Structures are given as C-alpha cells and as structure tokens.
Design a protein around this nucleic acid. Structure first.
Lengths: 142, 22, 117, 48, 103, 110
RNA sequence: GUAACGGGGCUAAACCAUGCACCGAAGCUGCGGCAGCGACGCUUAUGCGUUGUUGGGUAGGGGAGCGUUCUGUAAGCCUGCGAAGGUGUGCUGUGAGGCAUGCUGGAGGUAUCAGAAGUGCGAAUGCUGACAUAAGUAACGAUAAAGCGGGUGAAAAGCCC
RNA sequence: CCCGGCGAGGGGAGUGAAAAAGAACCUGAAACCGUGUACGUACAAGCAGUGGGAGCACGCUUAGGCGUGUGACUGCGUACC
C-alpha cells in the first residue's frame, strides 16, 4: 500500500494559550514553530498544515539572556536610497513587542505559501487578556 | 543595398559612414 | 536508390511530442524545445527514483518521533529499544502503526522502554 | 534449396563503419578522427 | 486483526482479504503460499514479537497473478560530453490474496 | 437548428474583426443587429452583412421566428494573406502582409 | 543592504575530554531482473535451479542490431468487405522499434531470407518555402489650407458642379 | 431560389460514388491562429520539470482506495550544442 497522507480538509486543530512571561525568546519560539508546523502529531504530512492555533500573551515581558537587551539589533531595509533601518531589542519591546515573537517564529518556520499559512495561526499579544475565548484555548505549558 | 555607416567595421550600425554596407 | 526521409522523421518527431504533453508553451509544441524537456524529465525521473526512498524514509522517521514523543520517548531511545529487543519492524510499518493503531504503537513503545533498561 | 533460403557463412559479411550517425553508433561527432588538427581535416594527413 | 510479514526484503501490513503485490516468487498460480516469518499479529489484544518472529502464527495466501508493472524509462544524459542512454524496465510482481491469518 | 453564413476572404485582419465578433456572441440577433449598427468599426460593417445573411438563410431555407434566434457561435479565422513589397530607406525592401479573414456566424433559435 | 554562524535564534544550541544512542550516499546488505569474461554438478545442433567475478565514462578501439528506399523470392501473398499516407488508442521489446484496430483516405502494399545504398538531422550567422515576434506599435513621403450647398451612388473629407 | 451593391462571399437546390472532389479543386502533416468544454489560476518569486499529493470533472466495477484530464501545496532541480 501507500504511506498515509493527512487530507487538508479533515485536519483537526486545537487552540493553546502560552504565557511568554520570563521565558527565553528563541527557546520558546522554537517550540512555537514546532507546534505551528505539526511536528507533535503522528499524522504529520510535510505539504499539509496539520499544526495548531497558538495564542501568545504577555509578549512584552519576554526574557533574553546575556547583554542582548541592549545589544540585539533588528535590521530592516525599506527599499530606498538610504533604506537601512536599525532598532535594538528594547526599542522593539517599547515600540511593538508583538514583532519580537513574530520575527523569531517566522524565522524558525519554512518559507513559501505553506509556511505563511502556518504563521497565520499565531496570535501574539503584549497583554494578559485576549479575544479568542469563544475558541476555548486549553492552556499550554511552554 | 549599400549605405555604410560605421567608422570602420564591415557592417555595423552607426551613423557615420565609411564602414558598413551589408 | 534515393531515400526520402519524411515518414520516419515524422514518426520520430511525433514520439517526442507525445512524450511532451502537459508541458508549458513550446515545450509541448516545438520539437527542439520538447526534446530537451523530455530528456530533462528523464534525468529527473532517474534522480528521483533515488530521491523517493530518501524522502519516504524522512517522513516515516518524523512520524515515529512524533508518536514516540506522544508516548514519552525520543526517536533514538525508541530505536535503541527496538534493537535491544530484536524487533525487525521497519520504519514504514512503524509509521503506519503510529498513524492507524495507537494502542499497538503504545505496546511497541512499552516493549522498547522495557528493553531500554 | 530456394532463393529465399540461402544465407552466407557467419563472419563473411561484416557491415562497415558509417561515420557520423549519432551518439549511439560510437562514430558520430567527428567520426573516429578526434578533434582539430591537420588529420581531422578533409583531404588532410601528411604524405608517406 | 492485521499482520506484518516479510517476503521480498520488504515488510507488509495486511488484513484478512487484501491483495498484496509482492516481488516474484517461484510459486505457481494456484498454490497457497505460507509465510511463516510474521513480525506482528495485532488486534485489541495483540501478539507482538519478542525474538523477531512470532513462533505461533502463520499467514496463508492464494497466488492470484504473475505480471509486470509499468514500463519505466532510464535516461542517462551527460551534457556537453556526447553521451546518452535510453533504457526500458518492467518489474515482475506476484499479486497474492491473503486468505488466512493464524494468530 | 444551426444556420451558417460566411464571409470568406474578407479584407480585414483577424485581430480587428475578432474585437467586434466578441461583442455579439451569445446575444439575441435583434439586439446584435443594433449593437453592430451603432458600432463605429469597419468590422461591424463586415460582420453585420454576415449576420443579416444568416438571418435570411434561416428564414428562406429552414428556420423559424426571428424573435427566437441567438448568435450562439461566431468566429473569425485567418485567411490567405497577400504578399506586397514596401520600399524603405537605403535600398531596403520590406514585405507587407495584407491579411484576410474568414468570418463565420452560426445562428440558431434553440 | 543587515552582509566575517546560511538564517532564525543560542550563555548553550559555544570550546575541550569521555562515552553511548541515532540520522546520514546511487557505499554495503536484503528481494527480483538483465548482460560481459573465466570455469564446475547434468551433459553436444549444449540449455541452464546453477555458481565465481565484472558492468561510470570523453577522444578512441572492438562486438551486436533496428529502421528507410530499391532488387530477387514474387504472374506469389494481402487489398474497393478498403492499400500507401494522415490522426488517436491499446498491447509488447532492454533500445532503435513492432503488432492490432477506431476515424480520415480512396488504390496500391509486401511476409521471410538474401542483396545494394543519394540509408536515419537539432545545431553548420546551413539552403528553400511557410508562419510567428516586436504590434495592430512606428509611419501614411515637404507646415501651399481648406470650408459649405447640391448631384451621382450601396456608401462621399477626397469624384462632378 | 434567398441575403448582398445587376458585388465579393455564403446558404439551399441540383450533378456526382464522393462537394469530409466547386476550379484558391486527390491525400491534407507541423509551425501558427481561433471557438467550445473540464480543471487550475488575482499574497505570490527563478531552466517551468520531476517525486509525493488534496480537491474537482468524467468513465469504472455493481463497494475495493485503480484508469483519463487538471494540479492547490511540498522535497529536489541554474536549457542544449
């Protein structure tokens, strides 16, 4: 016979709340990108998005080690004459701390259409309250 | 045909005129 | 004896154009492009009969590691436990049991855990 | 003994090199002559 | 109840009544083969292996068909170096029909 | 019942006549005649004669009931082009393709 | 343009030492199949349940074949109950290929075994013909200049008045 | 005979074995250009394939996870001489 393939129209997804308070950035983000892809399910197919919906909260209280809070720099280029723009870690935390978790996870996810549809299942929040209480998110201990 | 047109080739384009009749 | 070429040339072109169906643009309409496309598809078929075994091995190992961690053991400890018990089930069948029969896979994980120590 | 039942002895009627007939005949693309130089030219080769 | 056996260097997971495409055996098209090297018999309560063979289980199958699969095309091409080979290949198989699992 | 009219070897490019033939496909024929009447292309003049001739061939040959008819199938094919010489500068000769069309209108009440 | 870990990230997910696990190739092994060279069980127009070993390949050498046109076989065999050719489908050979039929075609084709070649094309800024592309794009050939009424006509900025 | 300009071109009728022989005339290939239908395509990057593969359409057998067409997504993959 043939190897099982999870059909993308009967994949059962769940909802999880992770509190990112005081955890290391990438050491939380790799378990995020692991469960977003579906590597924790025995029915995992690489071309199907079998992963879970994940809600991350308190993302302005995420911890980094070393001297990285004043020295980890994020670079983006706008596409122009000068173009190169440059913000440190704590500036990103003061400015929009959802993008810290989202840049870490989007880097740890595959590229292409399916990796973006995996990134779409990540709901990051800088507060302690969220809006998906209808989804009944069971609590995840990451 | 016979108009020439380059400084010096056997046949290129060129708006000059001593090299160039294809 | 003079030999016209047109019939056998037409047959040799129609074979290549028949093997080029589905292709984009001149790759399915034009003999010069379709011949290169058919030979390139042949090289890919040769390379990917080898690549298929590697990819299915990767998928089987990813599903075994997923279901073993669903049961509380890593991949390497689980394969060590199935070697230290003399169990010859390959990774295709272990992935199939990991998908379809989770209680039988739980039995195999308990066997490998008891053999592991 | 009819005219469509005769046949030569084996080893009598070797075919002959036809040069320049594709990859798979062994003698396409320069046909046994190698690459450039005086010997591969038409009418080439030095005298006795 | 299903069962894992091993015929052509490969393993197969099969139930009562499936057709299995194996590599070619030297068995005629009417004889019921017996695979005595069975690696797992499973049910709600399952007989796995300890030592690698189930000692008290055996699988029996009616040989249905001998045949050959799709013609596959081997293309060896070496660019700019004046070399290609085309080759065909059809692989022999034996379709057996699993008539009995003996736990 | 299908009823075909053709203008074979029409002296217009196929690309020009297809732009007018895509106006009146699927339309009723009474509406398509007015669409072609108030269209300011030369191809409208060419394809209106073919449509009117299809109406008349339906009426005279077998047909029915001009209120019923639709323009179900209209297509333009490329015809035999004429080859002409166009002198250009510096003794260069271009060719002119004088492109012809075949215009086909199938009218059918059902 | 971050630009001297590929990247994300990492205080180990860094370095050294000790191990054991595991992944990892077209390597080795398992199952099936083909072929080349040297040789043993049965035994010859020798076939192999066999069994040792070998099988990447350019220039090049050697060996075996397929197809095309024409000639003999052949005033024979198929064919208007449908030949050649064209267009699909299926089956088959390790390959060049081959076989059988649907439709189109409307009068010739040719088994096998031999023979002879104007015998096989993708390239030569190849040659001839056809058709694309740029593209319905530039341009419509002196910047002396036209406007209206009537006529003819299927239709008039251009023809006649 | 009918449309049209006492056009060109076409539709009938008729001749014929045949107009899938109408003179732009046996056979009618390919490039090229269309019409209709099935599927895909408007958040997605590259020699356009290949390996896997969901869904859909249409034949299936009277379930059997297979054919034919398309191919979301995914691993690998920088033409030929």
């Amino acid at each position: 016979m043939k190897t099982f393939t999870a059909k993308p129209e009967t994949v059962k997804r769940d909802w999880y709340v992770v509190d990112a308070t005081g955890k290391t950035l990438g050491r939380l983000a790799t378990e995020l990108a692991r469960r977003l892809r579906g590597k924790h399910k025995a029915e995992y197919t690489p071309h199907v998005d079998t992963g879970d919906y994940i809600i991350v909260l308190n993302a302005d209280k995420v911890a980094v080690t070393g001297n990285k809070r004043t020295d980890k720099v994020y670079y983006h280029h706008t596409g122009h004459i000068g173009g190169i723009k440059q913000a440190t870690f704590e500036e990103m935390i003061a400015r929009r701390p959802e993008r810290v978790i989202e840049i870490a996870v989007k880097g740890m996810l595959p590229k292409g259409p399916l990796g973006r549809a995996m990134f779409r299942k990540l709901k990051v929040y800088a507060g302690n309250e969220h809006n998906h209480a209808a989804q009944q998110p069971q609590v995840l201990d990451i | 045909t016979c108009a020439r047109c380059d400084s010096x080739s056997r046949c290129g384009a060129x708006g000059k005129x001593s090299g160039x009749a294809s | 004896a003079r030999v016209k070429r047109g019939v056998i040339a037409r047959a040799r072109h129609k074979k290549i154009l028949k093997q080029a169906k589905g292709y984009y643009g001149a790759r399915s309409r034009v003999y010069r492009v379709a011949f290169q496309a058919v030979i390139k598809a042949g090289q890919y078929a040769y390379r990917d009969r080898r690549q298929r075994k590697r990819q299915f091995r990767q998928l089987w190992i990813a599903r075994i590691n997923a279901a073993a961690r669903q049961n509380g053991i890593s991949y390497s400890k689980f394969i060590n436990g199935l070697k230290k018990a003399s169990v010859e089930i390959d990774r295709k069948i272990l992935a199939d049991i990991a998908v379809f029969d989770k209680v039988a896979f739980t039995a195999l994980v308990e066997k490998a855990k008891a053999a592991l120590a | 003994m009819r005219l469509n039942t005769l046949s030569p002895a084996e080893g009598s009627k070797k075919a002959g090199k036809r040069l320049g007939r594709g990859i798979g005949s062994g003698l396409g693309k320069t046909g046994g002559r190698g690459h450039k130089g005086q010997k591969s030219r038409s009418g080439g080769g030095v005298r006795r | 109840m299903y069962a894992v056996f091993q015929s052509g260097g490969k393993q197969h997971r099969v139930s009562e009544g499936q057709t299995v495409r194996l590599e070619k055996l030297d068995i005629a098209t009417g004889e019921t083969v017996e695979f005595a090297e069975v690696l797992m018999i499973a049910n709600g309560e399952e007989v796995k292996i300890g030592v690698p063979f189930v000692d008290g289980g055996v699988i029996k199958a009616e040989v249905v068909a001998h045949g050959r699969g799709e013609k596959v095309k081997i293309v060896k091409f070496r660019r700019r170096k004046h070399y290609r080979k085309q080759q065909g290949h059809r692989q022999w198989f034996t379709d057996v029909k699993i008539t009995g699992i003996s736990a | 019942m299908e009823t075909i009219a053709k203008h074979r070897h029409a002296r217009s490019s196929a690309q020009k006549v297809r732009l007018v033939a895509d106006l009146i496909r699927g339309k009723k024929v009474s509406q398509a005649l007015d669409i072609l009447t108030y269209t300011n292309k030369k191809a409208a003049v060419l394809v209106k004669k073919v449509l009117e001739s299809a109406i008349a061939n339906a009426e005279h040959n077998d047909g029915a009931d001009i209120d019923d008819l639709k323009v179900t199938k209209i297509f333009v094919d490329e015809g035999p082009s004429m080859k002409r010489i166009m002198p250009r500068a510096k003794g260069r000769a271009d060719r002119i393709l004088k492109r012809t069309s075949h215009i086909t209108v199938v009218v059918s009440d059902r």
